[PDB]
Amino acid sequence: LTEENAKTFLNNFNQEAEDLSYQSSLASWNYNTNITEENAQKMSEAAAKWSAFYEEQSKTAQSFSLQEIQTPIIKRQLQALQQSGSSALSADKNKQLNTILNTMSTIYSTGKVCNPKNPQECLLLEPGLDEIMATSTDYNSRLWAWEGWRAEVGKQLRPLYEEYVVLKNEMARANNYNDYGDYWRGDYEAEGADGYNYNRNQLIEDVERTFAEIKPLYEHLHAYVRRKLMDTYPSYISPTGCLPAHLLGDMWGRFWTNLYPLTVPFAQKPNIDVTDAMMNQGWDAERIFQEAEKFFVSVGLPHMTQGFWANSMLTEPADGRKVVCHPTAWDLGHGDFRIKMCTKVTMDNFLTAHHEMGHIQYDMAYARQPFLLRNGANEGFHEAVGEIMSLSAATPKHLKSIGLLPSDFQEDSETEINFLLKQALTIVGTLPFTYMLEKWRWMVFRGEIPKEQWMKKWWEMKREIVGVVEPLPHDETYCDPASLFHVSNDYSFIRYYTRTIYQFQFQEALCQAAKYNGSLHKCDISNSTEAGQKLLKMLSLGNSEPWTKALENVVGARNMDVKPLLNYFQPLFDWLKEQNRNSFVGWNTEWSP
């Protein structure tokens, strides 16, 4: 019988997949904490053997017919195994696509943009241009760096994107998908049971529905940021017009968090930074991760393993080995959970340690699942369950409980409002950018945007959706999206949108579980074991069930809800109403300086 054959095939596949995935993950860890040519090549054959084994098992797994399989966990495992990906093509087309992707990665990593009449101070983005976007206040230098990076990326990446779209569409339609956006939307597809059925074509309209009512909050925030930038730039920004693209604090305007000194409500009130209290008490990275573990055992999550403390690097080693500064939580397999972090004694690294320990607890909880179901429910769940820990670790209640903040602290409304505004610039401001970028990529991959009407469409929707106008006109020789990291390296971007929605949904669920009677942004889930059990009902699932069932298990809803997001920012939304009576909320699509 076919289902028993699939059960024995999965039983044979799981242990060898776990062994080879552990070897590949251990080689990747050995490269990431010790950069050399030997670790790089060991990672190369380890990933090559693991990928070849996965593809040769997926070719055999595609021989099974799913119409006679009744057990939904076996059917979900065979659905996860049958995703061939880019191997469905011929060798020539796959080699061309891999060449295009690798030359995109090497031209994004080594792109250089530098000055008229001053060639010698000639800069990469990663040391210098992000510093120019974050720190500099001069209008012409930002216009320089923005237009130069747009030119020196788009002029070289427009035809690369022209064949990239066609080859990715061929990759998707070789796997019985409509387009490559539909291939990305197949990560949100749910087929199990009745009432839990989620479709790819549903997702876009769900995103538009959840964007229909974040739009007033974003419009008020945009009006306030525009007025404060008009205070900064006196005549270069129109009161009724859109914001210029190079005054948003980032290279692209993805995060507005670098506008906080420019757009502060109350400059005389300090922030909730407790780094100096860590330095005065002599805290180190071990005490940071021990306090994170104390938080997780206070909420009800399990203790950290002994191999976690033994094998993780939590400090710059200074032993001559190069490391990656990016913090990453690693689930190597066979119960091995590690964290690669170059921890300085700061509050931001404390919150990042809580975030990566949230990732580690998420990886630890579904370890009882089979190997093909040891993932997130979708791509947003994995980062949302870390962002909720980053939310709870930053509250003044948690810092007053662990002695980092004094017991006689008075939390007035001014520092609460500017904390909420910093959170909005980090969190709310990336949502129209994310929805724009994924909508544009979906319309390009679907073919709804014609090939010769790319750039002027993009600056139409940025005049329409995000409310940001271009500083200079761009023709179709440019490729202005391709300046971003996630699109030049073939990454889905809607996971940040779903992360942002699921984060506040999970936060209301855990604060209603913990019986907190105050506002949502002041809520701490510490010392609440029932919130931990409500959390572990979802974290133990993995993707063994549809993500709508896990979402109903947490919040009691089967879809994305942004009422928790507006409830989190309710005092700030009231404050933004209170200082937008005389101003004009909204923007005009016609170019106003």
Partner: protein, 99 residues
Amino acid sequence: YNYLYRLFRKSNLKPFERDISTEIYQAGNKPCNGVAGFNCYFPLRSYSFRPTYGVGHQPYRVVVLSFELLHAPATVCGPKKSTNLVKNKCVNFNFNGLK
């Protein structure tokens, strides 16, 4: 890679039974004929022990002591309690059962 286990077998083991056979497990209808592949699996899988594993996957050595009594005289009999010897006093003695 020197520690192995049996993952596939046609029927369950009887108590205190061993199976050291390396016959290819036929999971389907096509005959295996000694060659592995699809629906034809080698029954012995390796316990690839590594020191960085989690505690539930770290190697544990197990010794099972099974005691049996038969009609034969029971010749495996452990230590018997002995106290110090006191002389020249009227005490209760018990040597080899004789009291």
